[PDB]
Each structure stands twice: as structure tokens, then as C-alpha cells.
Amino acid sequence: GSSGSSGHEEEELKPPEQEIEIDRNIIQEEEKQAIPEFFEGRQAKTPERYLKIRNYILDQWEICKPKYLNKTSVRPGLKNCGDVNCIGRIHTYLELIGAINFGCEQAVYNR
Numbered sequence: 605g606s607s608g609s610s611g612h613e614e615e616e617l618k619p620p621e622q623e624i625e626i627d628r629n630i631i632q633e634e635e636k637q638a639i640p641e642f643f644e645g646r647q648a649k650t651p652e653r654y655l656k657i658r659n660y661i662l663d664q665w666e667i668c669k670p671k672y673l674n675k676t677s678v679r680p681g682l683k684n685c686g687d688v689n690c691i692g693r694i695h696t697y698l699e700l701i702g703a704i705n706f707g708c709e710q711a712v713y714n715r
Contacts, residue, residue, distance in 0.1 A: 617700065617713060618700070618713070619700070619711070619713035619714060620700060620701055620702030620706065620713070621702075622702065622706075623702045623703070623706040623707075624701050624702050624703055625703075626662060626698070626701075626703045628655070628658065628659045628662055628663075631651065631654075631655070634701070635658075635697075638697040638700070638701070639654055639693060639694060639697060641693070642654035642690075649690075653685055653686055654690075654694065656682070656685050657682050657685050657686055657690065657691060657694050658694050658698070660678055660681060660682050661673075661675075661678055661694060661695050661698060661704060662698065662703065662704060664677065664678055664681075665698075665703075665704035665705060672705050672708050672710040672711075673704065673705055675691060675692060675695040675696075678691065678695065679691055696712055699711060699712055699713070700712070700713055
């Protein structure tokens with residue numbers, strides 16, 4: 605027989621090594637690999653909508669930087685574009701890559 609009962613490890617997640625660069629006018633595979641849902645081809649999820657939201661976040665990030673930027677500050681801001689389930693996807697990702705809130709104890713990867 606066998607037995608597991610093991611865990612408490614990273615969940616398909618990993619903290620950034622160095623602040624990267626992102627284009628608010630260009631969508632590189634880098635982002636598509638994390639936000640492929642908007643590039644799937646659904647009628648609800650569109651690639652044009654993913655940008656609108658992103659641009660906002662990427663913008664706010666610097667608007668507060670170097671200080672940390674909470675998603676709760678942009679949640680209500682772009683409540684019209686998409687939903688919370690999406691907002692988190694973009695925000696988080698960008699945070700995982702470093703594009704936003706780089707090196708900060710107030711991240712979602714260090715937690």
C-alpha cells in the first residue's frame with residue numbers, strides 16, 4: 605500500500621527575481637501565458653478588455669510606488685470592465701512577474 609498526507613508547498617506559484625518590463629500597447633506571449641483566458645476565444649472574455657484593466661493597474665502601481673498598491677484600490681475603479689474574478693487575475697499576475705509591486709513584503713507570492 606501507500607500513503608501521502610504531505611503538502612504545505614508552493615502552488616504552481618513563484619516569486620519574481622527582477623522587475624521586468626511591460627507594454628500597455630503591446631501584448632507579448634509573456635502576458636498571454638498568464639492571461640490566456642482572455643485570449644481563449646470566448647464571447648465574454650476579450651483581449652481588448654484585458655488591456656483596459658491592465659493599463660489601469662500598471663498606471664496606479666506607479667501612482668503609488670514605490671509604495672505598495674492594493675487591488676482594493678482598483679477593484680471599484682474598474683468594476684465596470686469585467687468582474688472581480690478577472691481583476692484579481694491581472695493584478696496578481698503582474699505582481700508575480702514583478703511588473704508591479706516589485707520586491708515588497710506586501711506581495712501575494714511572499715505570503
